[PDB]
Amino acid sequence: NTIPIGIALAQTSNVALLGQEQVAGAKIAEKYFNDKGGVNGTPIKLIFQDTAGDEAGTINAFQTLINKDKVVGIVGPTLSQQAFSANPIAERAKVPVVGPSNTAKGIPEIGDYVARVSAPVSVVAPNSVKAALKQNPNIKKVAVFFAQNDAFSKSETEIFQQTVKDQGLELVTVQKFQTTDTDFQSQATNAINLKPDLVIISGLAADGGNLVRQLRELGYQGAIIGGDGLNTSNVFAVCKALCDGVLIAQAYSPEYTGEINKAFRQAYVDQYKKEPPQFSAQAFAAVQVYVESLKALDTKNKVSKIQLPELRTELNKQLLTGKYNTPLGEISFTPIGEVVQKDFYVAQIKMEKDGSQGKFTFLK
Ligand code: MET
Numbered sequence: 361n362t363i364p365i366g367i368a369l370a371q372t373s374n375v376a377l378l379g380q381e382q383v384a385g386a387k388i389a390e391k392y393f394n395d396k397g398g399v400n401g402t403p404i405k406l407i408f409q410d411t412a413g414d415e416a417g418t419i420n421a422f423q424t425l426i427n428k429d430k431v432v433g434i435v436g437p438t439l440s441q442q443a444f445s446a447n448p449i450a451e452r453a454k455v456p457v458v459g460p461s462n463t464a465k466g467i468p469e470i471g472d473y474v475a476r477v478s479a480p481v482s483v484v485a486p487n488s489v490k491a492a493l494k495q496n497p498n499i500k501k502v503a504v505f506f507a508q509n510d511a512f513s514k515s516e517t518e519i520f521q522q523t524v525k526d527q528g529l530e531l532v533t534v535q536k537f538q539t540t541d542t543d544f545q546s547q548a549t550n551a552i553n554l555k556p557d558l559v560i561i562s563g564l565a566a567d568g569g570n571l572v573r574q575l576r577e578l579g580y581q582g583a584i585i586g587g588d589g590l591n592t593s594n595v596f597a598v599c600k601a602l603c604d605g606v607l608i609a610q611a612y613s614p615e616y617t618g619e620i621n622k623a624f625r626q627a628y629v630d631q632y633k634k635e636p637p638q639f640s641a642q643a644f645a646a647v648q649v650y651v652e653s654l655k656a657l658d659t660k661n662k663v664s665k666i667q668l669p670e671l672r673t674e675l676n677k678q679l680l681t682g683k684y685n686t687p688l689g690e691i692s693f694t695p696i697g698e699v700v701q702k703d704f705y706v707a708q709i710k711m712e713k714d715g716s717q718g719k720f721t722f723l724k
């Protein structure tokens with residue numbers, strides 16, 4: 361006998377460039393917690409249902425997990441764009457959802473069954489602008505790009521734009537694109553002609569990487585900040601050597617000294633031969649929230665005897681009250697399921713000159 365937890369992430373489509381790291385983190389969590397006896401002796405079982413890259417796919421994944429797989433709760437989805445459409449399905453069904461990396465404004469507000477372990481754009485994004493200004497205090501003109509078809513990108517770019525204004529910088533242009541675009545010559549040239557010292561991009565991985573590369577191809581030599589959608593080594597293949605120098609804020613640091621992060625990091629590093637990326641840590645933390653909440657609930661009210669609808673409701677109630685020592689640091693939730701997290705960072709992409717390999721270097 362095992363306790364089913366649903367994992368609804370992008371395992372196909374271009375969104376899987378972001379989902380990949382999350383699936384990896386979730387699998388590491390499953391082994392980590394089951395090796396510790398699962399929920400008071402009862403193993404958990406992660407049940408994966410691919411969301412693909414759109415809303416319909418996420419709705420279908422949630423409904424399958426809820427109705428066929430009878431999961432006690434869901435971790436997912438990958439994108440805020442997907443969460444806004446699909447999470448209300450779980451809310452109405454009274455099934456908890458914990459978002460691992462949905463950072464758009466308004467996610468926890470979707471309902472009483474929606475929480476997230478991922479700090480939102482308003483708290484993560486401004487640090488990368490401050491970091492850019494530290495590396496070049498003479499930055500004055502800023503060009504901003506964003507994917508207008510993506511909910512998170514629209515949310516993130518508003519934060520970036522306000523931060524630019526508050527830092528006393530000149531916003532010379534705001535350019536729009538679609539996440540499905542591969543070509544950005546017109547927008548990139550429009551920005552370059554305005555001589556920005558800093559470019560900020562809010563998109564996803566393939567699009568963001570393509571835009572970074574094209575900006576460099578077209579001769580742009582200034583600073584570049586990428587938003588959370590570019591926060592994966594999967595961009596390295598796209599912009600290659602031209603990814604070098606891109607600043608990306610982080611809601612996770614491998615060097616954080618919590619015991620579980622040490623164990624998570626070591627488990628990750630030993631397998632993947634590189635530092636755990638943010639999306640992997642965040643997915644681990646989401647599974648952790650479910651395991652530790654299930655343990656706490658089971659101790660007070662043996663879960664093997666609770667019928668599924670009540671189990672879901674009590675698990676949701678429980679997880680909202682918990683304090684968790686996760687790879688992300690010590691976290692908890694507000695009464696509406698917003699994450700409470702103290703520490704944030706900025707990393708910078710460092711490419712090898714050949715362009716075949718790179719890493720994220722954390723700024724001190
Ligand atoms: C794992 S990709 C997440 C991208 C962005 N944080 C969003 O909310 O969609």
Ligand SMILES: [Mg+2]
Pocket residue numbers: 467468469470471472473474475696697698
């Ligand atoms: Mg909520």
